[PDB]
Symmetry: D2
Amino acid sequence: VKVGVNGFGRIGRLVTRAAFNSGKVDIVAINDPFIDLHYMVYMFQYDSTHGKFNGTVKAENGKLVINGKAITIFQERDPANIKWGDAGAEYVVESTGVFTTMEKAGAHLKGGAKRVIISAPSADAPMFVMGVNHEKYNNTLKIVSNASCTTNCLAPLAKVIHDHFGIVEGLMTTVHAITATQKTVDGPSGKLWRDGRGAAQNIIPASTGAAKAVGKVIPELNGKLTGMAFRVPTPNVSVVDLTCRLEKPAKYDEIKKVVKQASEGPLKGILGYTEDQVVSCDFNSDTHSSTFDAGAGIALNDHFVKLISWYDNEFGYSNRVVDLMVHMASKE
Amino acid sequence: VKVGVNGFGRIGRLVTRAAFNSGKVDIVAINDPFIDLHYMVYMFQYDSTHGKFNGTVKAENGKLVINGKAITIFQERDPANIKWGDAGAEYVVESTGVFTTMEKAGAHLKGGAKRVIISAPSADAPMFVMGVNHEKYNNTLKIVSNASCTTNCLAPLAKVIHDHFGIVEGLMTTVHAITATQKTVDGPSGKLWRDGRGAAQNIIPASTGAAKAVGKVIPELNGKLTGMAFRVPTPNVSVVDLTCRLEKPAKYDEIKKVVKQASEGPLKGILGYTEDQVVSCDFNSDTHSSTFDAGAGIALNDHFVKLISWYDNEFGYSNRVVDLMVHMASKE
Amino acid sequence: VKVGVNGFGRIGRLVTRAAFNSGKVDIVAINDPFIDLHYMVYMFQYDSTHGKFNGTVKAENGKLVINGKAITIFQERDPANIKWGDAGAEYVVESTGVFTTMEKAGAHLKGGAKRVIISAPSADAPMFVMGVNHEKYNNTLKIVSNASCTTNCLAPLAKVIHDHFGIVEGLMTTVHAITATQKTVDGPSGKLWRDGRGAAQNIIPASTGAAKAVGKVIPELNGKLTGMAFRVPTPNVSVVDLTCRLEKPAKYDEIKKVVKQASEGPLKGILGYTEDQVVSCDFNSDTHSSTFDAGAGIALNDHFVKLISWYDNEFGYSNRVVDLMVHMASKE
Amino acid sequence: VKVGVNGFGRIGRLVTRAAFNSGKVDIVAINDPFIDLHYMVYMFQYDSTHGKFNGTVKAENGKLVINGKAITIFQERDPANIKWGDAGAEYVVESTGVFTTMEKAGAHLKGGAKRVIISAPSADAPMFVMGVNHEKYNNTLKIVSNASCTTNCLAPLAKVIHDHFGIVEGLMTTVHAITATQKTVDGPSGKLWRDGRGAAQNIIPASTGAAKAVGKVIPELNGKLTGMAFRVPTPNVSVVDLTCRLEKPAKYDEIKKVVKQASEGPLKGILGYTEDQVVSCDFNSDTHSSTFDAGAGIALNDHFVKLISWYDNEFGYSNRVVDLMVHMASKE
Ligand SMILES: NC(=O)c1ccc[n+]([C@@H]2O[C@H](COP(=O)([O-])OP(=O)(O)OC[C@H]3O[C@@H](n4cnc5c(N)ncnc54)[C@H](O)[C@@H]3O)[C@@H](O)[C@H]2O)c1
Ligand SMILES: NC(=O)c1ccc[n+]([C@@H]2O[C@H](COP(=O)([O-])OP(=O)(O)OC[C@H]3O[C@@H](n4cnc5c(N)ncnc54)[C@H](O)[C@@H]3O)[C@@H](O)[C@H]2O)c1
Ligand SMILES: NC(=O)c1ccc[n+]([C@@H]2O[C@H](COP(=O)([O-])OP(=O)(O)OC[C@H]3O[C@@H](n4cnc5c(N)ncnc54)[C@H](O)[C@@H]3O)[C@@H](O)[C@H]2O)c1
Ligand SMILES: NC(=O)c1ccc[n+]([C@@H]2O[C@H](COP(=O)([O-])OP(=O)(O)OC[C@H]3O[C@@H](n4cnc5c(N)ncnc54)[C@H](O)[C@@H]3O)[C@@H](O)[C@H]2O)c1
């Protein structure tokens, strides 16, 4: 399937890289009004976090050429003005972060796009996490949401734990790496004052709806999960900490065994499993949505456990966006 | 009371600074075989985390002179060889971290010390947290432990919450700043391989006995609390995240009100309270054991809440060591 | 003298704090259209880098009250619309960074301001560094520039070295801490692509005109100095490295002696001197423009030396802005 | 040639990885008394800086098996006790850092090693930098030194600049990433007190003999070069800043052209060249000894220029150790 990408930030560029790295979808158009073609070459080629791009990238005839494939470049501030149809983009990755509603994402449909995939949590678009509820998608849904990186980490582990033991209630804290929304030094932020404080200097607490959003993709867990986030001075990798009351008794070894069986089975490539003394850098550029950390977690008793899951919030989420597009194209 | 300090690391130096800043105890002797007198002057004077020492510090006649008070300096590897009695040190702050047992800490008693206060968790010495169980101390206990920084953060909040609502069970994660035991780059560590990975680069998971140690100082909570730690790339401030099942129903406002009343009452100066958009740097050089973060925490229902508490793991713990010594001297 | 402050960023807030800390000038008005009064209270009160503000700050009757002194707050995007005269602000600290020309800074003069002090390098406003050329100011200059933090570091040391030995030619590199213009992660920047790369992750090279701007305030050094900058992952403190060919022979001890004599004399409080094993955190919240690091620097021969000078690029520059205003008020 | 490796730290492990990545030499024995076989598996497999090891690594029958090649493991504190000859190690990479003299490195010769390559600067062993003076090696030198990472960065650029223009005198500052010798928090260091201060918190000044060591490998530059270092809070990549007086006039374009021609010619793979807006992360895992940064550097006039060169102080130096061993084996 041919894919257009709206926005060339972390999510847009890394979705493009995942498309080229795996070859699963073909990027044909990119829209970003604030990044010119040559600046796009520079930003795609050099990445502080994930290294230099393997393969080639250059500007030719007003087009971005990645691995010999010319990509049409648009500079539009309004999505409706983008000529997705002329470039042949059937799907569009809405990755700017400011068009995360059905009506705002349908502006891409006006521009010739057949379907729109929002790479952020959406207030009203149907939300899918690969390996959790993606089979609930059907070819009548024009606009979908891939949820968040944190949601794509929590939802598979929560699905496994609820399926085998039953989550009566769970509380989540994610220790999250620095993102583009933060400030290098103490500065103004609209209403989230803590996010305005210097990111390298601080442990910063944040509200996140990812744990509650797990209730959308796992309806039986609706209202049983919520949590918060502490932003910390790390570039890329984040970790999920889920503390939950289990309906059925579960020794920690039983949870480990069930999660390992899930990681080796239907959730392979989505839910990871490890028993090594892993740290955050060990999952940089990892493509899993969630890697269960067996040794990091701890249990108080048979019904109250604390579960740890790592996730590259950049690479894994982009690969999941690509996989969602592949599944939607398969269901055409 | 006159105090000797064994070890001149973070804990020893900051305990000395707290002694001089508040004037509550008199430091008269310091033992450290790896730090000479002039190096001691340098390390006490300049602090990356807490700034330069207000007041004066210089070497005179083989003695460390802080604010005009001469301090005898010993360079001994074996605590029994230290002449605490000749210097007049009635109390000794065992802050090296490698003499955290009753028999090892009694070597200071051999050297003329009347009492020994271990500034680390102890396997067998009686353990006290200020504001939680310190009134259980009596003048017949020669060797005591001040627990850990994390324990001194968790125990007061846990005491308040258990007293008013009852903690059926709680799980703790502390997001902890970098400490001296970590490595700048990936390097060898004896058995804790994760602690060997570069501290600035990683979110690092760690086992900690602080939550279980809260059961020592609050016996009714024994076996009902445990947890883990994630070390992160920050210099000083750490935060406690307590997720607990409450015996009695508690709206989040009720918990806030109870904790604020405790912070304004018997636990004043020990348990802090704030409703501001605080980040970690806002508690650097703070002397509280635990400052409740009202806005950071979240509740799922009336019986399952996630509570957030900040703590300067260096300054607060040192001030608590000083306060424990003051209380013990009062109970002489 | 009564001072208005345009912009409430790092420079504006720290200039306000320096005004209140030293009591040398009276802040009466602050203009910032993007930061409301209560957000101004928060941002002034809590500082990640310099700690919490000693003293009180709260909102009263639409005014910012710092240490009991009410400050009028304006929310204007155009400087000409600001009613500086009604608030009584004789001087204005133009600290936004986007009004650094005579014509743009005169909009404040339209609003009732008697004089305007630009806290950034200016293309055409007369430029002054305290202790270097500030006596060249006269009461006929309505609009002046305080140069940059880097210029205020280099110019006093360069003045001393040129006066005593003669700088045939010098090249400067400043290792500079992270500032507000950088990005937490790799992101778009207009034309300076390197400044768009993640600040915590990288050593980042940058062009700076500070060394050439030293030629403005020391005319004999015009065209003899230039340099560059490497931005690094540190919050506050920066260091200047000056490599220069000396007209007259100078042993390193002679340079040390001359610089120490200057630091103890006419440049006291402006040019610092130390022979201690200082690191960057040892100058956090330091108010000097430049502290000579005797041990850090090295000489190749009697005519080719590398000189090292530390500077808190936030605190020192703000205190120099305050001192420039005090001198201008004295020359009224 | 078959290679033994003494020490399994950053240098030893990365030299092993470079040996396996390029296949140029065969690692057959590793000695490290502080790292057991399974800990060696862990430390080799997971790298925070350079990512996970591509290929396989596991413990089999008391041996480290990297890519199916069994490596004999020794746990000896004294080099003379190591049985290099039994394992068949013809060359030994002395990478511990504490056997950097001819007599100390000859203990490996006692253990059956034919030749010893010290991966640190040596006081008396002959010193070689690839592309600078390595052709001065001959098969009669049993013990050699590969100099330092900084020396391997400076020497090729200095060689090119001196050959084409002539370096009358140069001063060097390297902005260097954090290394294993530093401390996470303020702590004791033997005599280098600044290196004891927290590495993540500070810009730290350091003495380095690399610029003077360039005079060893380029005799015509002896006594004409020296410099210093500022350690900064970055994990891996370092940059060299060379400020030099040129004997012959050189426009900056001429220097750029000469350096680019050298990078494309005899120094290919050793001296890099780029004109992109590179930052430090753009050279992580780069194998060049020195990549000239054309845009970063600046000139004051035709005889006084400041030249910038990046270098991965870990990967590049290890690859140069491998290349030196390959050249020595070719000259057998
Ligand atoms: N990086 C993560 O960890 C992560 C993971 C999952 C989801 N997300 C979410 O995805 C969204 C994208 O964030 P990012 O991580 O890509 O960072 P980012 O801020 O680098 O990307 C934003 C890019 O969008 C472009 N843009 C802005 N307005 C536009 C417009 N009107 N039309 C077109 N292009 C426009 C800008 O050029 C900018 O480069 C955010 O909302 C983030 O919350 C982030
Ligand atoms: N910094 C914190 O956050 C914190 C808080 C509470 C408790 N603690 C615990 O307290 C202990 C002290 O740690 P720190 O934080 O002071 O760091 P640190 O490692 O700087 O202090 C150790 C100091 O002890 C000295 N020393 C070593 N062996 C000695 C001996 N045999 N006799 C005398 N002196 C000796 C060394 O010179 C070193 O400077 C650790 O076990 C730490 O776990 C740390
Ligand atoms: N921090 C340093 O190291 C330092 C030192 C000396 C000089 N400077 C220079 O001073 C300038 C100020 O930078 P800062 O360091 O204060 O950081 P900063 O970016 O925090 O400050 C900018 C503030 O100005 C306000 N502002 C923006 N547009 C405005 C407008 N049109 N009218 C009024 N207010 C407006 C914003 O609210 C923002 O908070 C920059 O150009 C910087 O280069 C910085
Ligand atoms: N990493 C760099 O940037 C770099 C580059 C070039 C040269 N160097 C130099 O190379 C030397 C090695 O440093 P590293 O960077 O490998 O870091 P490192 O400190 O991780 O390596 C040291 C290793 O040597 C082992 N070791 C210690 N004593 C030993 C002994 N007696 N016998 C055998 N093995 C022993 C220890 O297990 C440790 O893991 C240092 O002197 C460093 O200055 C470093």
